[PDB]
Amino acid sequence: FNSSIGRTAQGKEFGVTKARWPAKSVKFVQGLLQNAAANAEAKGLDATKLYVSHIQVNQAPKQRRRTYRAHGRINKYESSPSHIELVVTEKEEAVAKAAEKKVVRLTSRQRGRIAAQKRIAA
Amino acid sequence: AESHRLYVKGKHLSYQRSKRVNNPNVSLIKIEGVATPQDAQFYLGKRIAYVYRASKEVRGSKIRVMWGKVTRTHGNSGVVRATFRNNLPAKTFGASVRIFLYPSNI
Amino acid sequence: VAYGYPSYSTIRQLVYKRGFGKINKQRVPLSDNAIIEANLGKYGILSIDDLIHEIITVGPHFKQANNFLWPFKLSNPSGGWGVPRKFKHFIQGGSFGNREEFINKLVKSMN
Amino acid sequence: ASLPHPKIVKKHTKKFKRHHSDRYHRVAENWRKQKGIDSVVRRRFRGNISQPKIGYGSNKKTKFLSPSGHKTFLVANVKDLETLTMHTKTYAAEIAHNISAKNRVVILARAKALGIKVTNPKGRLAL
Amino acid sequence: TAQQAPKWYPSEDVAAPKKTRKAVRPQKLRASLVPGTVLILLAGRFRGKRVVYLKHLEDNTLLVTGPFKVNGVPLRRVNARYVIATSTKVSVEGVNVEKFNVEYFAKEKLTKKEKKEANEIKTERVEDQKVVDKALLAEIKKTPLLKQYLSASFSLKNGDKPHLLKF
Amino acid sequence: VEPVVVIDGKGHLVGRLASVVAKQLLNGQKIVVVRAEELNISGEFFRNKLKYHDFLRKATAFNKTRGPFHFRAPSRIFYKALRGMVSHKTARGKAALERLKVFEGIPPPYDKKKRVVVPQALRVLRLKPGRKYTTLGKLSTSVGWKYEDVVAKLEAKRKVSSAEYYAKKRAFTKKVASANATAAESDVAKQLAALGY
RNA sequence: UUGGCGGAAAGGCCUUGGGUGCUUGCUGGCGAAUUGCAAUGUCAUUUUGCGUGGGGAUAAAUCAUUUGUAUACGACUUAGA
RNA sequence: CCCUGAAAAUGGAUGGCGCUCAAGCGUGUUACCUAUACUCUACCGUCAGGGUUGAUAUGAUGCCCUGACGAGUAGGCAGGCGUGGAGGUCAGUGACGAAGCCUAGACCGUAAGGUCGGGUCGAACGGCCUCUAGUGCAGAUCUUGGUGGUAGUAGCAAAUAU
RNA sequence: AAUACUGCCAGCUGGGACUGAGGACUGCGACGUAAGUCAAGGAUGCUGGCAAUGGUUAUAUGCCGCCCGUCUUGAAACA
RNA sequence: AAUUGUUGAAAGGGAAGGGCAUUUGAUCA
């Protein structure tokens, strides 16, 4: 959602040219972040390795309002409330156990060929 | 021996087609060294192989081959018609295929 | 149409290869002399050779012999029509018109 | 355990979809003949979809035949399963979706006892 | 019942096939294929290697030899469609090939479940091969360069057209 | 046969050479064309100049930067000729185009390689004796090309170097022929003559 | 390994001396199989990361403030350890 | 044959590239490519000509044999799928899960449609032979409800000023 | 005399592609003195490999493909 | 369902969407 918005040099670090400085959304996100941090502290997760692994913003039911236009016409003037959710997680990913054996099927000619290579090579 | 080849080089030109309609079931193969149907009527019934390579092993090898046979001659330039068990992906309009010498009558 | 004088060899080839009879308003193939005798024995014709003879030499029962035979459905000529434009006269360089004895080659190519 | 039958061939393995089904959401994926005066599908131009025709049928000898060679029969109880006692070579049982597991296990046991193939053996069963 | 009843059930009685008037006849080999002929194999492990035709087995595969002191192909059976018969020929008179036959090369079909997921030759077979190749080289040595010719392997070079090459 | 085929542009008809090279590229053979400034076109110099002026006249009215790009170099003219012959819009045509490499003169990575001529696209073999032709280099330098002298000097230097190389090669070839003649008149020579080779 | 030539895209070529193999130019010996009548019957190259040894040095840009030869915002042009 | 006669407005048409003992023009001869065209074969449907109660054995509206054909707007006829209800039957299914919904999962039927596997879910539902209709949507500037591009855009600039 | 051209062979033969429908016998024919056999009212024998072929969907490639319904002789229309 | 946000997969030189056949990726008896 950056149609017909102004450009700035503060967004150059992200590679984009059009960026803004929202206020209400930033305060709401910061409040929910502090709530998540408090929840993690209460649960027992240290804040050293906590990273925001999920976030989601959906549209809430609209609060209908009214506006007045020319020639005695009534138009649509509601809001767009947000449903915000977020999940922070402790980061821990060193290595896995890979896949299974993945047994291959060998033709008789293929088996003879590998036997020949084994017999010939040291 | 520096050369170990038991086949004949061929180029996949295109399918048996028309101005606006093409038939993927039949392809056209040009044989190097053949210029007329009189000498093109020697590689008839021979098996053509497209030998391509993928990045995933199927049954121990990453090289997969599509097989077909020469049906008849097409044109006066030595081009021949070919019918494959599975039609060529049409991305190989100019690729190199191997026409084997079997079944051999000579 | 293209029409011309046929020969015995091409008549025999036509009757042998694409020879079909008309029995009970059906196109029953002629692979034995029994069917020909059953459907044409009243006119003295009882074999495929007799039918060919009646075709080549016009006789008393040529009308019935021709009516018994289904029209021959031939294919396109194997060696081509030999002309660039079919819809021109034979003297004008096409398949349209009388071909006289030249019809034998075209008939055998198409058969 | 199938009777010797000719290889099943399908003249059209694809699904006949209605025109503009992928263009408009109101148009569902159910075939409807185009009756428009200038409909390209109805006029059967080159490069458009193919209308179903009488020629796309299947051989009556290999019609209604599953790839396993057994005709599909819907069953709901043991008494229904007893119908295919002397016809197990051509017909295969199929438990409907409304039968609970307590009857499904009994139906499967009876089918195994009588040598009747079931097209859905792993249905509503514990993993 | 979800489905009421099939009105008529097909009879589960198999029908015998009709009598077929398709007899078998011996294979008619090509005029260029005559025992003692030098052959070039096109497909298989020993492709390009040159061999000698000895006997026509009853199973429509030619008995061929790769005499072991020349190139190392064993006494085998080869299909008629995977061989090119060269012009040169070395006779095989005095070489007994009556012992070799179809049941000589017994497959002994491998076991089903136990596949070679990991990890031989008969002394009788070695003995027959030695007996054959002794006389084979004894006759072959009468003409120059045949031993080196058969030891060398056939290959196709650039500019070589098989339709104009008289193999 | 050769993975890359080098074709000289001397005395070669533009249209016939373009058709041959386009057919080869569609077949799947890598082709590099050198000395494209020496290509010859049938008709007179004034005729081809008028044709090129007519081509130049064509341009987009509202924005001349989006109109036809009338390239002036002889190599670019040859490339445009082949592009008018190959379907560049399709991916196959694009691949055929990338298979092409057209240069003016004899590049450094191609001076020491064999050059091949097209017998069915040569002016001396197709044009009637006494017919008027033109030079692509002269046409380009009259139309607006500005690098006629540079390529001429480079070609002169390359010709001098190649002449020295051919002098050395001719000396070596004479020595080899003398060695073969001395080796002749022997039993191996008679057997080879009897067996053809 | 010594030297020379090549700038158009040189990035390649020639050459000097030694070492490491082969040499089918000619004459011998040894083994080739149970891969079963063909089933591409691999050995070439285009990138990314990983692991092992030798080798080369420890930097800039943007935002922030400000300048004005610049401008709607961008952007341009400057400066301040 | 060619040339003057022969001049119209965005930049362009033998399609263009291009072609000159032509790849231009007239004529003569072969080879080559193809239409849902022609010949044969496999399958489906329709029509016509027939056989088949000497059976346990049922569907003679069933089965099989032979031949021919298969385009199409308005329109007519015929054969079939599905929806809301009622009668007979399945002594039908189901709280250990009925209906509904979702499901680039599977099967059958050329097709309308049917069926299975999994998740959600919570009290009803289905097959067979018939009767009945308020029985099938893609449009009618269709009636109602909700939702998108525009769009975080126009704009929130009269009335002296914080 | 030979040869060119045309037409005939119920003369022979080499190579390649598609198709395998029907399912105990019924008929028309040939070989064989005779048993019996056959290319004679629709393909069988042997052998090899695997227990990958193939179905659905996404992308890619070669070709084709104008927007649904109505009015109209004429629709995709700048109706 | 229209619409919207994240995760997972694919494509994107002035459109997307479809048909004729196949390669590759995912999945399937």
PDB file of N, CA, C and O in Angstrom, chain E residues 118-154:
ATOM      1  N   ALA E 118      23.928 -55.533  -1.998  1.00  0.00           N
ATOM      2  CA  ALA E 118      25.338 -55.281  -1.727  1.00  0.00           C
ATOM      3  C   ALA E 118      26.144 -56.452  -2.273  1.00  0.00           C
ATOM      4  O   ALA E 118      25.588 -57.472  -2.692  1.00  0.00           O
ATOM      5  N   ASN E 119      27.465 -56.292  -2.266  1.00  0.00           N
ATOM      6  CA  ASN E 119      28.395 -57.310  -2.755  1.00  0.00           C
ATOM      7  C   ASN E 119      28.089 -57.714  -4.195  1.00  0.00           C
ATOM      8  O   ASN E 119      27.750 -58.865  -4.470  1.00  0.00           O
ATOM      9  N   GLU E 120      32.657 -68.595  -9.594  1.00  0.00           N
ATOM     10  CA  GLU E 120      31.515 -68.020 -10.295  1.00  0.00           C
ATOM     11  C   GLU E 120      31.309 -68.695 -11.647  1.00  0.00           C
ATOM     12  O   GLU E 120      30.306 -69.377 -11.864  1.00  0.00           O
ATOM     13  N   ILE E 121      32.262 -68.501 -12.553  1.00  0.00           N
ATOM     14  CA  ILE E 121      32.201 -69.117 -13.874  1.00  0.00           C
ATOM     15  C   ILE E 121      32.476 -70.609 -13.738  1.00  0.00           C
ATOM     16  O   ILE E 121      33.144 -71.049 -12.794  1.00  0.00           O
ATOM     17  N   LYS E 122      31.947 -71.394 -14.674  1.00  0.00           N
ATOM     18  CA  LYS E 122      32.082 -72.839 -14.602  1.00  0.00           C
ATOM     19  C   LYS E 122      33.344 -73.314 -15.315  1.00  0.00           C
ATOM     20  O   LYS E 122      33.663 -72.882 -16.430  1.00  0.00           O
ATOM     21  N   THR E 123      34.060 -74.225 -14.651  1.00  0.00           N
ATOM     22  CA  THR E 123      35.246 -74.823 -15.252  1.00  0.00           C
ATOM     23  C   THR E 123      34.907 -75.554 -16.542  1.00  0.00           C
ATOM     24  O   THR E 123      35.724 -75.584 -17.466  1.00  0.00           O
ATOM     25  N   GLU E 124      33.711 -76.141 -16.626  1.00  0.00           N
ATOM     26  CA  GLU E 124      33.286 -76.767 -17.873  1.00  0.00           C
ATOM     27  C   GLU E 124      33.191 -75.744 -18.999  1.00  0.00           C
ATOM     28  O   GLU E 124      33.662 -75.997 -20.114  1.00  0.00           O
ATOM     29  N   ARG E 125      32.590 -74.583 -18.722  1.00  0.00           N
ATOM     30  CA  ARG E 125      32.498 -73.534 -19.733  1.00  0.00           C
ATOM     31  C   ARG E 125      33.881 -73.054 -20.148  1.00  0.00           C
ATOM     32  O   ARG E 125      34.146 -72.847 -21.340  1.00  0.00           O
ATOM     33  N   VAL E 126      34.779 -72.876 -19.175  1.00  0.00           N
ATOM     34  CA  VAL E 126      36.145 -72.474 -19.497  1.00  0.00           C
ATOM     35  C   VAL E 126      36.812 -73.521 -20.380  1.00  0.00           C
ATOM     36  O   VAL E 126      37.546 -73.189 -21.320  1.00  0.00           O
ATOM     37  N   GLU E 127      36.566 -74.801 -20.095  1.00  0.00           N
ATOM     38  CA  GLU E 127      37.182 -75.873 -20.869  1.00  0.00           C
ATOM     39  C   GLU E 127      36.674 -75.883 -22.306  1.00  0.00           C
ATOM     40  O   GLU E 127      37.461 -76.016 -23.252  1.00  0.00           O
ATOM     41  N   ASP E 128      35.356 -75.748 -22.492  1.00  0.00           N
ATOM     42  CA  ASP E 128      34.827 -75.689 -23.854  1.00  0.00           C
ATOM     43  C   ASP E 128      35.378 -74.480 -24.599  1.00  0.00           C
ATOM     44  O   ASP E 128      35.724 -74.574 -25.784  1.00  0.00           O
ATOM     45  N   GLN E 129      35.475 -73.336 -23.916  1.00  0.00           N
ATOM     46  CA  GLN E 129      36.008 -72.141 -24.561  1.00  0.00           C
ATOM     47  C   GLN E 129      37.458 -72.342 -24.988  1.00  0.00           C
ATOM     48  O   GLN E 129      37.839 -71.966 -26.102  1.00  0.00           O
ATOM     49  N   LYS E 130      38.281 -72.928 -24.115  1.00  0.00           N
ATOM     50  CA  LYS E 130      39.672 -73.187 -24.474  1.00  0.00           C
ATOM     51  C   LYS E 130      39.764 -74.153 -25.648  1.00  0.00           C
ATOM     52  O   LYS E 130      40.564 -73.948 -26.571  1.00  0.00           O
ATOM     53  N   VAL E 131      38.940 -75.204 -25.639  1.00  0.00           N
ATOM     54  CA  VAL E 131      38.960 -76.173 -26.730  1.00  0.00           C
ATOM     55  C   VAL E 131      38.621 -75.493 -28.050  1.00  0.00           C
ATOM     56  O   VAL E 131      39.271 -75.736 -29.075  1.00  0.00           O
ATOM     57  N   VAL E 132      37.611 -74.621 -28.047  1.00  0.00           N
ATOM     58  CA  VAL E 132      37.230 -73.933 -29.279  1.00  0.00           C
ATOM     59  C   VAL E 132      38.331 -72.976 -29.728  1.00  0.00           C
ATOM     60  O   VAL E 132      38.747 -72.985 -30.895  1.00  0.00           O
ATOM     61  N   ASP E 133      38.834 -72.150 -28.805  1.00  0.00           N
ATOM     62  CA  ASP E 133      39.767 -71.100 -29.203  1.00  0.00           C
ATOM     63  C   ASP E 133      41.116 -71.665 -29.630  1.00  0.00           C
ATOM     64  O   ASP E 133      41.817 -71.032 -30.427  1.00  0.00           O
ATOM     65  N   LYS E 134      41.495 -72.847 -29.138  1.00  0.00           N
ATOM     66  CA  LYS E 134      42.742 -73.451 -29.598  1.00  0.00           C
ATOM     67  C   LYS E 134      42.733 -73.626 -31.113  1.00  0.00           C
ATOM     68  O   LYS E 134      43.596 -73.091 -31.820  1.00  0.00           O
ATOM     69  N   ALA E 135      41.719 -74.324 -31.634  1.00  0.00           N
ATOM     70  CA  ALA E 135      41.603 -74.494 -33.078  1.00  0.00           C
ATOM     71  C   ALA E 135      41.295 -73.177 -33.775  1.00  0.00           C
ATOM     72  O   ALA E 135      41.720 -72.968 -34.920  1.00  0.00           O
ATOM     73  N   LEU E 136      40.574 -72.274 -33.102  1.00  0.00           N
ATOM     74  CA  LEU E 136      40.239 -70.995 -33.718  1.00  0.00           C
ATOM     75  C   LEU E 136      41.495 -70.200 -34.056  1.00  0.00           C
ATOM     76  O   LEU E 136      41.683 -69.778 -35.202  1.00  0.00           O
ATOM     77  N   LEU E 137      42.383 -70.008 -33.077  1.00  0.00           N
ATOM     78  CA  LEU E 137      43.651 -69.339 -33.366  1.00  0.00           C
ATOM     79  C   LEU E 137      44.565 -70.184 -34.243  1.00  0.00           C
ATOM     80  O   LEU E 137      45.336 -69.627 -35.033  1.00  0.00           O
ATOM     81  N   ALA E 138      44.502 -71.517 -34.129  1.00  0.00           N
ATOM     82  CA  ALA E 138      45.316 -72.357 -35.000  1.00  0.00           C
ATOM     83  C   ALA E 138      45.007 -72.088 -36.466  1.00  0.00           C
ATOM     84  O   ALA E 138      45.918 -72.007 -37.299  1.00  0.00           O
ATOM     85  N   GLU E 139      43.724 -71.943 -36.802  1.00  0.00           N
ATOM     86  CA  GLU E 139      43.359 -71.592 -38.170  1.00  0.00           C
ATOM     87  C   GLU E 139      43.577 -70.109 -38.466  1.00  0.00           C
ATOM     88  O   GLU E 139      43.972 -69.758 -39.584  1.00  0.00           O
ATOM     89  N   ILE E 140      43.347 -69.235 -37.483  1.00  0.00           N
ATOM     90  CA  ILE E 140      43.434 -67.796 -37.712  1.00  0.00           C
ATOM     91  C   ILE E 140      44.863 -67.382 -38.045  1.00  0.00           C
ATOM     92  O   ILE E 140      45.088 -66.494 -38.877  1.00  0.00           O
ATOM     93  N   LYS E 141      45.852 -68.030 -37.425  1.00  0.00           N
ATOM     94  CA  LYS E 141      47.242 -67.628 -37.607  1.00  0.00           C
ATOM     95  C   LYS E 141      47.743 -67.823 -39.034  1.00  0.00           C
ATOM     96  O   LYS E 141      48.809 -67.299 -39.372  1.00  0.00           O
ATOM     97  N   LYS E 142      47.010 -68.560 -39.874  1.00  0.00           N
ATOM     98  CA  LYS E 142      47.453 -68.802 -41.242  1.00  0.00           C
ATOM     99  C   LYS E 142      47.476 -67.538 -42.092  1.00  0.00           C
ATOM    100  O   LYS E 142      48.189 -67.502 -43.101  1.00  0.00           O
ATOM    101  N   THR E 143      46.723 -66.504 -41.716  1.00  0.00           N
ATOM    102  CA  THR E 143      46.680 -65.283 -42.502  1.00  0.00           C
ATOM    103  C   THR E 143      47.162 -64.093 -41.679  1.00  0.00           C
ATOM    104  O   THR E 143      46.862 -64.002 -40.483  1.00  0.00           O
ATOM    105  N   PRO E 144      47.918 -63.179 -42.284  1.00  0.00           N
ATOM    106  CA  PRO E 144      48.475 -62.059 -41.518  1.00  0.00           C
ATOM    107  C   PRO E 144      47.410 -61.067 -41.073  1.00  0.00           C
ATOM    108  O   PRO E 144      46.365 -60.905 -41.710  1.00  0.00           O
ATOM    109  N   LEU E 145      47.694 -60.408 -39.950  1.00  0.00           N
ATOM    110  CA  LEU E 145      46.976 -59.257 -39.406  1.00  0.00           C
ATOM    111  C   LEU E 145      45.568 -59.574 -38.915  1.00  0.00           C
ATOM    112  O   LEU E 145      44.899 -58.670 -38.401  1.00  0.00           O
ATOM    113  N   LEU E 146      45.093 -60.815 -39.044  1.00  0.00           N
ATOM    114  CA  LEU E 146      43.756 -61.138 -38.553  1.00  0.00           C
ATOM    115  C   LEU E 146      43.676 -61.028 -37.035  1.00  0.00           C
ATOM    116  O   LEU E 146      42.661 -60.573 -36.493  1.00  0.00           O
ATOM    117  N   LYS E 147      44.730 -61.449 -36.333  1.00  0.00           N
ATOM    118  CA  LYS E 147      44.720 -61.397 -34.874  1.00  0.00           C
ATOM    119  C   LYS E 147      44.603 -59.960 -34.377  1.00  0.00           C
ATOM    120  O   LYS E 147      43.760 -59.653 -33.527  1.00  0.00           O
ATOM    121  N   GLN E 148      45.439 -59.065 -34.907  1.00  0.00           N
ATOM    122  CA  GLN E 148      45.361 -57.658 -34.522  1.00  0.00           C
ATOM    123  C   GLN E 148      44.044 -57.036 -34.970  1.00  0.00           C
ATOM    124  O   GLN E 148      43.467 -56.206 -34.256  1.00  0.00           O
ATOM    125  N   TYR E 149      43.559 -57.424 -36.154  1.00  0.00           N
ATOM    126  CA  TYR E 149      42.282 -56.921 -36.646  1.00  0.00           C
ATOM    127  C   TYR E 149      41.168 -57.234 -35.654  1.00  0.00           C
ATOM    128  O   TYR E 149      40.405 -56.344 -35.259  1.00  0.00           O
ATOM    129  N   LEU E 150      41.070 -58.495 -35.230  1.00  0.00           N
ATOM    130  CA  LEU E 150      40.005 -58.891 -34.315  1.00  0.00           C
ATOM    131  C   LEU E 150      40.235 -58.350 -32.909  1.00  0.00           C
ATOM    132  O   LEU E 150      39.268 -58.104 -32.179  1.00  0.00           O
ATOM    133  N   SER E 151      41.496 -58.164 -32.508  1.00  0.00           N
ATOM    134  CA  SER E 151      41.774 -57.556 -31.212  1.00  0.00           C
ATOM    135  C   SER E 151      41.328 -56.102 -31.169  1.00  0.00           C
ATOM    136  O   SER E 151      40.833 -55.636 -30.136  1.00  0.00           O
ATOM    137  N   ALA E 152      41.496 -55.373 -32.270  1.00  0.00           N
ATOM    138  CA  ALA E 152      41.039 -53.996 -32.332  1.00  0.00           C
ATOM    139  C   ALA E 152      39.512 -53.937 -32.316  1.00  0.00           C
ATOM    140  O   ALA E 152      38.821 -54.896 -32.672  1.00  0.00           O
ATOM    141  N   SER E 153      38.988 -52.789 -31.897  1.00  0.00           N
ATOM    142  CA  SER E 153      37.552 -52.576 -31.776  1.00  0.00           C
ATOM    143  C   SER E 153      37.083 -51.593 -32.838  1.00  0.00           C
ATOM    144  O   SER E 153      37.785 -50.629 -33.163  1.00  0.00           O
ATOM    145  N   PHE E 154      35.891 -51.843 -33.375  1.00  0.00           N
ATOM    146  CA  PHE E 154      35.326 -50.988 -34.408  1.00  0.00           C
ATOM    147  C   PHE E 154      34.753 -49.716 -33.795  1.00  0.00           C
ATOM    148  O   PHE E 154      34.134 -49.746 -32.728  1.00  0.00           O
TER     149      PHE E 154
END
